[model samples]
Target: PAFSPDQVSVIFVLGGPGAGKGTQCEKLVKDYSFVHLSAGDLLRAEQGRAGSQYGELIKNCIKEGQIVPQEITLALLRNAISDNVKANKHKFLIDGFPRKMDQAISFERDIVESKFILFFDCPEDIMLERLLERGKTSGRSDDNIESIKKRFNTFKETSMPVIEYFETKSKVVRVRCDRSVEDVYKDVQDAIRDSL
Candidate 1:
């Protein structure tokens, strides 16, 4: 908590399943030298981690398709950001986070608002197609069609409102994701760099 908020610049990437939030974050990190911190990945690391304080809680939360408590996630982010700042990591790309309104509120309490939010908008049909195809050999447990639809449903019910909340604050950069991956990144890079 001793870290100065003034030194950090973070971009929050929000999108439904298969909308390429993770893909864009990887590109951003490679092209722009940003430190990418994925909330889901972070929680996954601790979910069944040996001797981790929140291991069981995280595992249960993940199994229930519910968010892990904000206290644990924010505390993890705080420590990570502090360490990143200490290491001179400036720009941060947070992938797959703040899915719930409370988490966004909690993030502000811990580290202030994100520099801007990226909303990668894609239609449900295309998203579903991509997921089911990927699920064929993706090897991820939740890659099946049923679980894929659940992700879309969950995002609409729980996460869409969070983006709407930030939209009102005029901090969102929404991008249409029905195009080629490279074309999408064109807009992504422009929006990401323009804010700098």
Candidate 2:
């Protein structure tokens, strides 16, 4: 691992697409000196970069609607953290990562062991409504009903096992995200304060 646990803190944030993971992360950054890294955002950024060698591969994988290779994903994450640490940003909230069992293993084995997982729990029905409402104004093509439901199914099938494994180790803080953003953030704050 490149980072020692004492110097760097990593919190893996997991939730369905519209579960308010990003919303909570926005609030966290205000109170904590945390770098919020979204794996999806990184991949999309890289895929759009003009000279990145991995662009085409990432583009195809994302177009095929699954994860990119761990080598590519982990390298991007490692680079993101290392670059930030040079500027003194040490605490990190990595969102929407470790979507599969192998990704979970590779990240901890290759980067740094995470302090804990911030898992946002929201029922699919609520998530569906939130996403559909966002689609009304978001302008993002993937925000449509058909694509949103597919992503929800993918999250449950692919990411839930990673959460389950960490649960047995007692390293997860599950927050209910069905409530209003402010209400949900209260629990998120409490969870981080107690853990970190």
Candidate 3:
């Protein structure tokens, strides 16, 4: 419920690979002026400063497919919002976040309530095919067949319940991403329009 006076809308974007999450997130940033915060990118950007002060203390089991500390991620998210808020920015489209229940809970405690969650409901088989196909050119470490299967399974086990959490709260809007990009883009706009 309640939103702070200067608090703007925060929307969490959820979906498995090939769900067009990245593709549409880019469009939203360009069209809707929504600040996009990708948790993965944030991590890499921070980790990129290998010899930086924060990295030496923070890189415990990073790149080992383990959960990085929530404090670090939440801090980045907070600073991002703080910076934008100072500039009178309100709306946000946070991709690659709240991958676990703790993240969802702690994020709310650490920042503010999200306006909603966007669910790109695409099937797993299609997701697998898309990820593997993208891996050929994407060159991402976690894009292989074995990694894709693990990610899908992990998404089912760890990530889906977070969707269920928002679903029960009536804060989730699902879009069928197996359809055309233009169709999904329209749905994404429609979803944000309510909060606008």
Best by lDDT: 2
Q: Residue 1 in model 2: shift from native, Å?
A: 1.2
The lDDT of each candidate is 0.81, 0.86, 0.78
**Worst lDDT 10-window in candidate 1:** 1-10
Score residue 2 of candidate 1 by CA lDDT: 42
What are the per-residue Cα lDDT tens digits for candidate 3 across 1-196? 2335247788899997668888899988888778888887777678767565567434432333445677787877778878888897887888978888998998876577888889999988878778778888778766767666667777888888999998999989998888788998998888778755
Residue 116 lDDT (model 1): 86
Off by over 4 Å in 3: 1-6, 52-65
Residue pairs of candidate 1 with colliding backbone atoms: none
* Model 1 residue-pair collision total: 0
Tens-digit lDDT string for candidate 2 (1-196): 8778877899999988889987899889998989899998899899889899888788666544566888888888889998899989888999988888898998888778999999999999998888888878676556776667668777888888899989998998999988899899899989988986
* Local error of candidate 2 at residue 119 (angstroms): 0.4
Per lDDT, what order, best first? 2, 1, 3
Per-residue lDDT, model 2, residue 74, is 84
lDDT over C-alpha atoms for residue 176 of model 3: 88
Best by TM-score: 2
In candidate 2, residue 2 scores what lDDT? 74
